[PDB]
């Protein structure tokens, strides 16, 4: 078999290969990841920082 | 006492409940012991010393 004969990739390829359409699809799935991860990081740093504020018993003696 | 407010009782109701008990206060100007009614920052007292 000649090395100029590429194997069969037909059953894994997209039948309509559009650059703009196929890139917007992939970036929308990583943006969803980055949106939720950025939301979960805010709730993590807020949980630890807020534990350093005045406790319930201290606030009662204001 | 303050943890019952907004959970099972009203603020004005818990205050009345706490005022029916007595707690140690700061000594007076001569240094004798004193007592005072309870506040919201106090803890629920037990029956035995
Ligand atoms: C809801 C969020 C989506 C998550 C669901 C997963 C998913 O989309 O799987 C698609 C999946 C097929 O996509 P694939 O296997 O990744 O390959 C298709 C190619 O991407 C071939 O398609 P493509 O890459 O050319 O697609 C371009 C894209 C175009 O759409 C976009 O670009 C999205 C708009 C961008 C917003 C900015 O169109 C879509 O795929 C529509 C969005 C989905 O669909 C299914 O397998 C159907 C499952 C239904 C059964 C449900 C019962 C359980
Ligand atoms: C802590 C959680 C923070 C989550 C932040 C997620 C985020 O903002 O990711 C955005 C970018 C995207 O990363 P990318 O996949 O290389 O984007 C492709 C570049 N285009 C073609 C779009 C210009 O990712 C980056 O720029 C690198 C972020 C690394 C963290
Ligand atoms: C560096 C140490 C990191 C430790 C991470 C341990 C993760 C183990 C999973 C346990 C759940 C999270 C622990 C409690 C944190 C929390 O706050 O979870 C509560 C939050 C929502 O709560 P809230 O915002 O409504 O209330 C907060 C009180 N005002 O849930 C989430 O957003 C889950 C999202 C997790 C994604 C975090 C991604 C990593 C960020 C790193 C920076």
Residues of A with CB under 8 A from a CB of B: 56-57, 60-61
Q: Indicate the resolution in Å.
A: 2.4
Q: Which domains does chain A carry?
A: 1-55 (1.20.5.270)
CA distance B24 to B20: 14
Q: Residue B18: is it exposed, middle or buried by C-beta count within 10 angstroms (0-12/13-18/19+)?
A: buried
The alpha-helical segments, DSSP class H, found in chain B are 11-18
Residues 6+ apart with CB under 8 A from B9: B17
Q: How far is the CA of B35 from the centre of ligand 1 (A)?
A: 74
Distance of CA B30 to the CA centre of its chain: 24
Task: List CB contacts (< 8 A) between B2 and chain A.
Answer: 56, 60
- Indicate which technique resolved this structure: cryo-EM
**Phi, psi (deg, nearest 5) at residue B36:** -155, 155
């Amino acid at each position: 078999k000649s090395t100029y004969r590429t194997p069969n990739f037909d059953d894994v390829l997209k039948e309509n290969n559009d650059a703009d359409k196929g890139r917007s699809y992939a970036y929308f799935m990583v943006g969803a990841m980055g949106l939720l991860s950025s939301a979960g990081a805010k709730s993590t740093v807020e949980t630890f920082i807020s534990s350093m504020t005045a406790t319930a018993d201290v606030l009662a003696m204001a | 006492w303050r943890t019952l407010v907004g959970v099972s009782h009203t603020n004005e109701e818990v205050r009345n409940m706490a005022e029916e008990f007595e707690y140690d206060d700061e000594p007076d100007e001569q240094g004798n012991p004193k007592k005072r009614p309870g506040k919201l920052s106090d803890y629920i007292p037990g029956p035995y010393p």
